Amino acid sequence: EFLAKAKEDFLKKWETPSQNTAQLDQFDRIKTLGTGSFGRVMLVKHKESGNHYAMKILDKQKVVKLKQIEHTLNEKRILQAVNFPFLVKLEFSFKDNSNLYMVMEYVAGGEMFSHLRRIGRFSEPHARFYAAQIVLTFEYLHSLDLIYRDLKPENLLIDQQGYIQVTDFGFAKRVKGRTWTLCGTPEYLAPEIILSKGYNKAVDWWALGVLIYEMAAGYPPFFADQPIQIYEKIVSGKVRFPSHFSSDLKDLLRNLLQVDLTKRFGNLKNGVNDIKNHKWFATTDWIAIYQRKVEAPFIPKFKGPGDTSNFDDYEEEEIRVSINEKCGKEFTEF
């Protein structure tokens, strides 16, 4: 019962979105946290509050040149207009001559990708703790008719509390009918996307399969060095499970990694419950997880405010801002 409010609290935000709520000179460009295109998340020192944040930088020209304008307003409209424990909180957004900027709550834990490769693989219970969180988020998201469409360890951050934060909404979209864009990450694409069938929520769930398989197995289920070959394997759906998988696990996977939509978990009559109620999730306290009254497997090792020990290092370029507005027409809705 509580939930339905979420919806309204969202619709409100969504039609009348926060617009321009700061400018570059209130933060101190500390360190590059990540490169994209274009690109380059920065840890920043906010001058007054001293509060620390992460600011996604976006060169209007690249986006524009890479036919990515829609995806970008999508990212933002959506992302201010939403609210969840495991969704990254957006503090300010604004623009200038050259760039687009989004300031989110800085998640210091680093990437689950980072951890995974380093560590090797996750214990079922360990993976299960993350998985649980993702399940919930997708639930809340689909409730509002939003798909994420870009699940992967590289897009999942850990907070100091050991919990998860979903990170890159560049593909998130509000879809009521059925949408058509071929995007995501090769290793994580649902067959219906590969094949230009048109789709909605089930693609998110397929992704869920892939993620869990990767967490526990320490690698993804569909693999090759040539992308097409990955795709081929995806579209047949047939996948080996590593020797060391609980029976309860291999089962669940078979139900998420279902090419047959009439069979894929998440897309069925009882929708998402077929999942929460699945046996693997037995030990899972969904009410408790929500509130974060569960204890995290792993705690990121953090030192002091604004530590970036958990992130890789890139070579810092300096932010240039043209004397001339660029692509201003295009990003007005921003």
């Binding site: 071929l182 990450t185 047959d260």
Partner: protein, 270 residues
């Protein structure tokens, strides 16, 4: 390790559904067609989706030593060889190395049909040849426009069923996602008079003929049948046969119920 390399996202140009014909010889067609059918993006398409795409594939012919495509030089173009011979070489550094051959057959660059991916080798024409290109955007469009059309409205169909009026739209869409196809040929039997009724059909084109042993009914495009299969599994009322060349939609019911529950639970709604 480089298991530590991140997996970058990929994305094609968009298109929401809400003319182009390059000419070629009867032969030329069959040849290309059977050159593509084994390719992931082509193994699938219904013969007209297939057909609109041969249509869309343009002719490019080349002077010898012409750079058919250059390594690093872009890709939204996939090419199948019609005629000609070809050298392949890649400059990995540094070293510049002939790799392999193409002798009047073969294709390359289909990944370009999904999202942009810069050719990895340079293809040089050894001698006079010609090939068939296909841009990505032109292709996504053909394929999407189609399913979009050849999906909603399948629907005047699904929602033309008196058994299904009480569905909500999303639920109907769920069914559109998965409903399958069957082409039947004149005289080939569709439904048998005694078989475990497991699915309902809708003539996409042609006509079906239901009979009990003397013709009880005849179905044309738009109309359904074997519908009782939704409410009662009991053995087939009658039999269905193909008058001419008929194409039908086919929905196995177990499948159906997994998605929406028992059909009757739905009728009871309102």
């Amino acid at each position: 390790i480089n298991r530590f390399t991140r997996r970058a996202s990929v994305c094609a140009e968009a298109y929401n559904p809400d003319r182009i014909i390059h000419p070629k010889t009867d032969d030329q067609r069959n040849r290309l067609q059977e050159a593509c059918k084994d390719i992931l993006l082509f193994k699938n398409l219904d013969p007209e989706q297939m057909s609109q795409v041969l249509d869309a594939m343009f002719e490019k012919l080349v002077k010898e030593g012409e750079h058919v495509i250059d390594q690093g030089d872009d890709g939204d173009n996939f090419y199948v060889i019609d005629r000609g011979t070809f050298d392949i070489y890649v400059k990995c550094d540094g070293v510049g190395r002939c790799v392999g051959n193409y002798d009047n057959r073969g294709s390359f660059g289909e990944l370009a049909l999904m999202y942009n991916t810069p050719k990895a080798a340079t293809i040089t024409a050894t001698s006079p040849g010609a090939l068939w290109g296909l841009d990505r955007v032109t292709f996504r469009r053909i394929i999407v426009k189609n399913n979009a059309k050849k999906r909603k409205m399948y629907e005047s169909f699904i929602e033309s069923l008196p058994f299904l009026k009480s569905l909500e739209v999303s639920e109907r869409l769920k069914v559109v996602d998965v409903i399958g196809t069957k082409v039947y040929n004149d005289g080939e039997q569709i439904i048998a008079q005694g078989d475990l009724a497991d699915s309902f059909f809708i003539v996409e084109s042609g006509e079906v003929k239901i009979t009990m042993k003397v013709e009880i009914a005849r179905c044309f495009r738009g109309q359904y049948f074997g519908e009782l299969a939704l409410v009662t599994n009991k053995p087939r009322a009658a039999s269905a046969h193909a008058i001419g060349t008929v194409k039908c939609l086919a929905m196995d019911v177990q499948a159906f119920e997994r998605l929406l529950g028992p059909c009757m639970e739905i009728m009871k709604r309102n």
